[PDB]
Amino acid sequence: YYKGQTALHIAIERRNMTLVTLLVENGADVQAAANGDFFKKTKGRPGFYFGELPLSLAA
Amino acid sequence: YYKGQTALHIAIERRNMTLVTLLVENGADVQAAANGDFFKKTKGRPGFYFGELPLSLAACTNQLAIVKFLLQNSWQPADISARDSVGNTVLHALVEVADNTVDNTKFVTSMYNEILILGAKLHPTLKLEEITNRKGLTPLALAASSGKIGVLAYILQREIHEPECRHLSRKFTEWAYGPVHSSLYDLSCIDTCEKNSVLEVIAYSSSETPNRHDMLLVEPLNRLLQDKWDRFVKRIFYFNFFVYCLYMIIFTAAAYYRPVEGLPPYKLKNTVGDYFRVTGEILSVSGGVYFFFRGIQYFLQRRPSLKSLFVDSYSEILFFVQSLFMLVSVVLYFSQRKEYVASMVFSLAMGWTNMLYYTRGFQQMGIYAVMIEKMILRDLCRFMFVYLVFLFGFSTAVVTLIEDGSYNSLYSTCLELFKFTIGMGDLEFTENYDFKAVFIILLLAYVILTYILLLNMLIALMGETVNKIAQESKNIWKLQRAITILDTEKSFLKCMRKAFRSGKLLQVGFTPDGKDDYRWCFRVDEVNW
Ligand SMILES: CCCCCCCCCCCCC(=O)O[C@@H](COC(=O)CCC)COP(=O)(O)O[C@H]1[C@H](O)[C@@H](O)[C@@H](O)[C@@H](O)[C@@H]1O
Give A13→chain B minimum CA distance, Å: 6
Helix (H) or strand (E) holding B223: helix B219-228
Q: Name which residue sits closest to atom 7 of ligand 1, judged by CA.
A: B353
Secondary structure letter of residue B148 according to DSSP: -
Q: Residues in chain A whose beta carbon is closer than 8 A to a beta carbon of chain B?
A: 13, 38, 46, 48, 57
H-only helix segments in B402-431 = 410-418
Q: CA torsion sign, B115 to B121 to B122 to B124?
A: positive
Interface contact A46-B178, CB threshold 8 A: no
Distance CA B34, CA B5 (A): 6
Which residues in chain B have their CB less than 8 angstroms from residue A57's CB? 178
- HSE at residue B36, side-chain half, CA atoms within 13 A, is 14
- Contact, B525 vs A46, CB < 8 A? yes
Helix (H) or strand (E) holding B439: helix B436-447
Which residues in chain B have their CB less than 8 angstroms from residue A48's CB? 177-178, 180
Residue B423 annotated in ligand binding = yes
Which residues in chain A have their CB less than 8 angstroms from residue B525's CB? 46
Residue B163: CB atoms within 10 Å = 8
Distance CA B381, CA B375 (A): 10
Which are the contacts of B496, defined by CB distance < 8 A and separation ≥ 6?
Answer: none
- Declared resolution, Å: 3.7
* CA nearest neighbour of B311 among B135, B476, B488, B487: B476
- Contact, B255 vs B281, CB < 8 A? no
Which are the contacts of B225, defined by CB distance < 8 A and separation ≥ 6?
Answer: B199, B216, B478, B481, B482, B485
Q: Output the CA angle B52-B54-B60, nearest 5 degrees.
A: 95
C-alpha separations of B217 from B116, B197, B228, B478 in Å:
26, 17, 15, 8
Q: Output the CA angle B433-B434-B437, nearest 5 degrees.
A: 100
Q: Output the CA angle B162-B165-B169, nearest 5 degrees.
A: 100
C-alpha separations of B3 from B10, B107, B134 in Å:
12, 29, 22
Identify the three-state secondary structure at position B174.
Answer: strand
Q: If you write DSSP's letter for every residue of B255-296 in order, what string do you get?
A: HHT---SSSS-----SSSHHHHHHHHHHHHHHHHHHHHHHHH
Give B180→chain A minimum CA distance, Å: 8
Burial string for A12-27 (b: 16+ CB within 10 Å, else e) reads bbeeeeebbeebeeee
Burial string for B97-114 (b: 16+ CB within 10 Å, else e) reads bbebeeebbebbbebbee
C-alpha separations of B431 from B406, B439, B485 in Å:
12, 10, 64
Angle separating helix axes B314-334 and B340-354, nearest 10 degrees: 150
- Contact, B71 vs B78, CB < 8 A? yes
Q: Residues in chain B whose beta carbon is closer than 8 A to a beta carbon of chain A?
A: 177-178, 180, 182, 525
- HSE at residue B22, side-chain half, CA atoms within 13 A, is 7
d(CA B212, ligand 1 centre) in Å: 18
d(CA B292, ligand 1 centre) in Å: 17
Give B178→chain A minimum CA distance, Å: 6
Q: If you write DSSP's letter for every residue of B468-495 in order, what string do you get?
A: TTHHHHHHHHHHHHHHHHHHHHHHTTT-
Q: Name which residue sits closest to atom 28 of ligand 1, judged by CA.
A: B315
- In the sheet that holds B180-185, the strands lie side by side as B171-177, B180-185, B522-527
Q: CA torsion sign, B37 to B39 to B43 to B49?
A: negative
Q: How many residues does chain B have?
A: 529
Q: Nearest-CA residue of chain B relative to A13?
A: B178
Secondary structure letter of residue B28 according to DSSP: -
User: Which residue out of B200, B309, B312, B314 has the highest number of ligand 1 atoms within 8 Å of its CB and is therefore the one to mutate?
Assistant: B314
Give B175→chain A minimum CA distance, Å: 11
Residue B13 annotated in ligand binding = yes
Q: If you write DSSP's letter for every residue of B505-529 in order, what string do you get?
A: --S----SSS-------EEEEEE--
Distance CA B319, CA B431 (A): 49
Q: Nearest-CA residue of chain B relative to A38?
A: B177
* CA nearest neighbour of B491 among B334, B290, B289, B347: B290
- Contact, B173 vs B527, CB < 8 A? no
Q: If you write DSSP's letter for every residue of B182-193 in order, what string do you get?
A: EEEE--TTTS--
Q: How many residues does chain A have?
A: 59
d(CA B315, ligand 1 centre) in Å: 5
Angle separating helix axes B273-300 and B234-256, nearest 10 degrees: 130
C-alpha separations of B327 from B20, B254, B258, B334 in Å:
71, 15, 17, 11
User: Which residue out of B206, B212, B318, B486 has the highest number of ligand 1 atoms within 8 Å of its CB and is therefore the one to mutate?
Assistant: B318
Secondary structure letter of residue B177 according to DSSP: E
- Return contacts of B461-468, CB within 8 angstroms, 24+ apart: B461/B379, B462/B375, B462/B379, B465/B374, B465/B375, B465/B378, B465/B379, B466/B371, B466/B375
- HSE at residue A36, side-chain half, CA atoms within 13 A, is 17
Q: Nearest-CA residue of chain B relative to A12?
A: B178
How many helices (H) and strands (E) would you count in chain B?
A: 20, 3
Q: Nearest-CA residue of chain B relative to A11?
A: B178
d(CA B168, ligand 1 centre) in Å: 43
User: What pairs with residue B522 in β-bridges?
Assistant: B185
- Contact, B182 vs B523, CB < 8 A? yes
Residue B172 phi, psi (nearest 5) = -135, 160
- Contact, B69 vs B32, CB < 8 A? no
d(CA B372, ligand 1 centre) in Å: 9
Residue B315 annotated in ligand binding = yes
Distance CA B400, CA B382 (A): 28
- Contact, B216 vs B197, CB < 8 A? no
Q: CA torsion sign, A51 to A55 to A57 to A59?
A: negative
Identify the three-state secondary structure at position B171.
Answer: strand
Which residues in chain B have their CB less than 8 angstroms from residue A38's CB? 177
Q: Which site among A14, A37, A48 would you substitute to test the B interface, given the most B Cβ atoms closer than 10 Å to its Cβ?
A: A48
Which are the contacts of B457, defined by CB distance < 8 A and separation ≥ 6?
Answer: none
Q: Nearest-CA residue of chain B relative to A39?
A: B177
List, chain by chain if needed, residues with CB within 6 Å of any ligand 1 atom: B 312-315, 318, 346, 349-350, 353-354, 356-357, 369, 373, 376-377, 476, 479-480
What percentage of chain B's residues is helix, strand, coil (to nearest 5)?
55, 5, 40
Interface contact A48-B525, CB threshold 8 A: no
C-alpha separations of B272 from B276, B277, B286 in Å:
7, 9, 22
> Which residue positions of A form the known binding site for ATP?
2-5, 13-14
Give B179→chain A minimum CA distance, Å: 9
Q: Hey, which bits of B81-211 come out as E strands? A: 171-177, 180-185
d(CA B371, ligand 1 centre) in Å: 10
Give A14→chain B minimum CA distance, Å: 7
Cα B318–chain centre separation: 17
Q: Which site among A10, A12, A13, A38 would you substitute to test the B interface, given the most B Cβ atoms closer than 10 Å to its Cβ?
A: A13
What percentage of chain A's residues is helix, strand, coil (to nearest 5)?
35, 0, 65
Q: Which amino acid does the sequence have at B367?
A: I
Distance CA B528, CA B514 (A): 35
* CA nearest neighbour of B92 among B139, B52, B136: B139
